[PDB]
Design a protein around this nucleic acid. Sequence first.
RNA 1: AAGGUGAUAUGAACCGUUAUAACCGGCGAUUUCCGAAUGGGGAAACCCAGUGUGUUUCGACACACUAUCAUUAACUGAAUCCAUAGGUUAAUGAGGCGAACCGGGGGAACUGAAACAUCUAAGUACCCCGAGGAAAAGAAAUCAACCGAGAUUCCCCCAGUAGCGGCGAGCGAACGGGGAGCAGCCCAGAGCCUGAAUCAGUGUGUGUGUUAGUGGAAGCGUCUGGAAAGGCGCGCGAUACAGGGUGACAGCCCCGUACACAAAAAUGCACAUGCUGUGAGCUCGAUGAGUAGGGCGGGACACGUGGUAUCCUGUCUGAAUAUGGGGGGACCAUCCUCCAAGGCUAAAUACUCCUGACUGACCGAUAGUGAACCAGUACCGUGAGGGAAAGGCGAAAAGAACCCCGGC
RNA 2: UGCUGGAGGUAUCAGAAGUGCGAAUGCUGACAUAAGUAACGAUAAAGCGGGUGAAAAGCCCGCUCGCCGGAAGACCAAGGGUUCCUGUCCAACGUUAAUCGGGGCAGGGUGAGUCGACCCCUAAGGCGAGGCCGAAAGGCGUAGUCGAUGGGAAACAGGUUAA
RNA 3: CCUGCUUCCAGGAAAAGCCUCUAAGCAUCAGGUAACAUCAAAUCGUACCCCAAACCGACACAGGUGGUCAGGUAGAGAAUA
Lengths: 93, 102, 46, 63, 77, 20
Amino acid sequence: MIREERLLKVLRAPHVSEKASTAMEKSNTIVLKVAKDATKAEIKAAVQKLFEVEVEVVNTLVVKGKVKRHGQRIGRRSDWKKAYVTLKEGQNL
Amino acid sequence: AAKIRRDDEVIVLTGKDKGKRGKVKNVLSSGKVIVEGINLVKKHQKPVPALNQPGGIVEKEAAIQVSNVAIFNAATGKADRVGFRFEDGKKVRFFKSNSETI
Amino acid sequence: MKRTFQPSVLKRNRSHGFRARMATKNGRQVLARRRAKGRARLTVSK
Amino acid sequence: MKAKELREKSVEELNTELLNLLREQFNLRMQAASGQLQQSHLLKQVRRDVARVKTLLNEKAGA
Amino acid sequence: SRVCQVTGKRPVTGNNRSHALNATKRRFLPNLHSHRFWVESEKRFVTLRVSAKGMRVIDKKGIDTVLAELRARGEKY
Amino acid sequence: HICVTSKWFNIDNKIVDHRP
RNA sequence: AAGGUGAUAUGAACCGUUAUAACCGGCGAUUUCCGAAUGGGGAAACCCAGUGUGUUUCGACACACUAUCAUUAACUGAAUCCAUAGGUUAAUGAGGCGAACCGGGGGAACUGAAACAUCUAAGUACCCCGAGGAAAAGAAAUCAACCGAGAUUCCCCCAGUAGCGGCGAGCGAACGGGGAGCAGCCCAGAGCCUGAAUCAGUGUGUGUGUUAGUGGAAGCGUCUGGAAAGGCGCGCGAUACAGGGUGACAGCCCCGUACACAAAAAUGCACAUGCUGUGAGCUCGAUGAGUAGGGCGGGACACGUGGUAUCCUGUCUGAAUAUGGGGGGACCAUCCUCCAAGGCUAAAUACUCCUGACUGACCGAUAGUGAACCAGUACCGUGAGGGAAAGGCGAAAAGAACCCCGGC
RNA sequence: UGCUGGAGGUAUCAGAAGUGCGAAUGCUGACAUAAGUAACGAUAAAGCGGGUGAAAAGCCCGCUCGCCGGAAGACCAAGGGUUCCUGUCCAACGUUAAUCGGGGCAGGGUGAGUCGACCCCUAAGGCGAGGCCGAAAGGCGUAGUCGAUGGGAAACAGGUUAA
RNA sequence: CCUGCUUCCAGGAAAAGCCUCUAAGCAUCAGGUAACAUCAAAUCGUACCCCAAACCGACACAGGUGGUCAGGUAGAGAAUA
Ligand SMILES: N[C@@H](Cc1c[nH]c2ccccc12)C(=O)O
Ligand SMILES: N[C@@H](Cc1c[nH]c2ccccc12)C(=O)O
Ligand SMILES: [Mg+2]
Ligand SMILES: [Mg+2]
Ligand SMILES: [Mg+2]
Ligand SMILES: [Mg+2]
Ligand SMILES: [Mg+2]
Ligand SMILES: [Mg+2]
Ligand SMILES: [Mg+2]
Ligand SMILES: [Mg+2]
Ligand SMILES: [Mg+2]
Ligand SMILES: [Mg+2]
Ligand SMILES: [Mg+2]
Ligand SMILES: [Mg+2]
Ligand SMILES: [Mg+2]
Ligand SMILES: [Mg+2]
Ligand SMILES: [Mg+2]
Ligand SMILES: [Mg+2]
Ligand SMILES: [Mg+2]
Ligand SMILES: [Mg+2]
Ligand SMILES: [Mg+2]
Ligand SMILES: [Mg+2]
Ligand SMILES: [Mg+2]
Ligand SMILES: [Mg+2]
Ligand SMILES: [Mg+2]
Ligand SMILES: [Mg+2]
Ligand SMILES: [Mg+2]
Ligand SMILES: [Mg+2]
Ligand SMILES: [Mg+2]
Ligand SMILES: [Mg+2]
């Protein structure tokens, strides 16, 4: 095809979180933590194949890890990517 | 190679429960062991708000040194110490003082 | 009044960064000493 | 689960290969993350299974 | 570098000494020159950076020998 | 505490020349 | 092997019990990105390519390869026809890091002289280059003194002597003797005989060490106590009374210890051979020239130019060649003794980033490593760089259910 | 020897030294003193009512009052790096209290063919195959290759999120 | 508008994108121009402070910090009230 079926392990988790997620459900589109190296087109494919839905276009943004806690030293979390996916019309999941 | 093991009957050797006997409920990474009914303590367990919330005093088993329990003979009714080897196919444990094997 | 540290990352990296450090026999000895000292930040970079 | 497929055919294996991912692994992540998956240890194996899968096939072909 | 391609002569450090014997570091460096040499055995000129003596050797041993050396040793030339 | 930075000047400064 | 899924760290969900749980060792596999970084770039962990591959959804993305230098070959190929330089490809090797010991290129000043130039500190500190398991040195153009010795290296003497020295401060040998370890060989070449000694690289074998392991003796009674290993009594093992642990001090509770054993695999070391590369052997030859020496300038020799031998050479010179030449501390004779101007060479010697085991009239938390602790950390500094504090509940968490004041 | 303490200590005669502290404007830590004294960081200024609360001069809401308005309003770059928003808590941080916060804990939040970087292009300048030079380290520089503070295609009015 | 216009001396970046020109080269081809249709535009930044309590000043420090916008009354005014 263009992207091997193997590499459609880019979808990592739904981000069903906040009205941001759900209130932007009730007006098209779904959002997801997705890989890190994922290429919009590369992640559209995943959502076509798996999930078997339609997809108009996909937007991406990177979330930066909050650094916190600790006394002297310090701990930081990992960065990760957001989805915001926007399905064509016969919208299901 | 452990001279004492999981299901296994022993007589306490030192302290508190000097003379008592019991089965090894389970043995620990530390080389300490829990012998059922044997070395008891009274944990004041705290309540936890989200379910299993009541909490209360609880009598419970407290790990103790394997150095301080001996395997029990039954044939003689005393502590016996262990030893190794047949040359059978396996190894197995025999009571010292009568190669009695078990 | 204007004080001595006027931060600027471009200058920072260009003057003290890994590659700059790497571009000179002595700059390299700089790292070598810091490695031998077991330093956690060889050169304060991104 | 090792020699069980030491002899399982280079082409054939790439099947379970996908079947570990194609099914178990992807479904498991999704299902898990979504708060379903009550038996977490399934994530440990599958991943470890794919490792086996790829250990052969790599050692069968070419190496 | 100021190295004689024939003898390997290079600058060497020694001292100055005044009439009061004050030592001041200094260098003796060789009498280099660079010289177009005809080989004939290659129908060509070759410029070697050469010391006098380097020349006097070439005079005696004769060019081609000297050129066996250098090439034997790897000198560019 | 964290509490540990002392950059004590130079004397302090003003005046004095105390006739020579 | 009967228990396991590293630690803070419970919990969840699991896995295993007579052999595919875990754990230990041998050999494999995978091994993102940056970093010598090597496809180009770059503000390290990022941007962008050329060419090859890759798609019953053969686009764009993914992967592989493409740095430079050296050697060798091949093909190409100017001014210039020949020929070179230049250019493409290819095969090999290099590159970077690393504690000391080692050889080499450079090389201070404080300081000492009760000041300071000579002299000292000192060929030290430091910079640099290079290499090995050791390095270097080494098979007399050496000493001796008319008797003799017989490579190099290290140790003790000789001796703080002889000497050097603003004869100040200081520096400081050798001869000869006692020891450690000892080893000797090639090239400067052609003929015959030819791959014959040997060395390295390598495959195999064997033995021996290594990287997991196995077995391993014998204690009970009672007293005090929260707890016995302690006291007292009576037994027992000892080729095992090294040591650690266990509720207080244990040969006989545990782990060991002495002792006896063990390797599927990979390896260090020896031999034994196979393969590659290499030369052995006899006859007859050959015997290290811009060198020795000298002049000038420095430097090395304990030796500061001194009556100064000897060694090295920046500079200008320049022999003899066995009936010859070097040295014997100016120099000459005689005598004696050695053979420079090509190389190789093991041991006695040096060192410890690191592995294992063992030891101490060494420290015990302001000590000892800066660091007994998640320390080169927190912190300070643009940076180089500097650089802390901080160990102990109990035998066992049995780490205080529940009630009361208080602002859940 | 009493008390405390709760596990080590060692006569004797020999032996060996990190062997004795009040001073060094010594070193480290702890604790005094002045003293409940100065001070609480612009003289733009507050008053009251009602909420909440264990507690309100300081928070919330309201009505007045006052202050900036070429700023003391508004958008950024540089620099910071979660300080943004929402719940929750008030020990420590806040020069007072604190129900409040840029403070603790948890959760959320950054959506681009068109803005910007990457990218093409170069200035200063940097690096620099070969190369010239240099005891070593290295120096300079050609071909190039990098480097914006400058050049280079393209979206506007309105709405909506607690953010 | 204006990178204009007038004037003066101190005489006022570079390169690419863009336009055009052809060489080797291709000549039915390929390319070039236009209309319509369609497909592609990845990646990274985007919160918040920014004359300040969030940056440089050890501090919630009377200091320092470049660019942008600029209403009414009086006023020459970005002064001042
Ligand atoms: N007043 C100062 C003396 C002084 C005078 N000039 C100075 C300059 C710098 C520092 C101190 C001083 C003191 O207390 O000692
Ligand atoms: N000596 C003068 C002036 C003075 C003040 N401070 C000083 C510091 C250095 C020298 C001089 C001064 C005085 O005390 O009145
Ligand atoms: Mg984005
Ligand atoms: Mg690269
Ligand atoms: Mg590169
Ligand atoms: Mg002096
Ligand atoms: Mg004789
Ligand atoms: Mg054993
Ligand atoms: Mg035993
Ligand atoms: Mg000779
Ligand atoms: Mg040698
Ligand atoms: Mg310490
Ligand atoms: Mg103490
Ligand atoms: Mg004292
Ligand atoms: Mg005193
Ligand atoms: Mg007072
Ligand atoms: Mg007063
Ligand atoms: Mg006051
Ligand atoms: Mg914060
Ligand atoms: Mg906020
Ligand atoms: Mg307070
Ligand atoms: Mg906050
Ligand atoms: Mg450019
Ligand atoms: Mg070069
Ligand atoms: Mg240059
Ligand atoms: Mg710019
Ligand atoms: Mg914004
Ligand atoms: Mg404030
Ligand atoms: Mg301020
Ligand atoms: Mg004004």
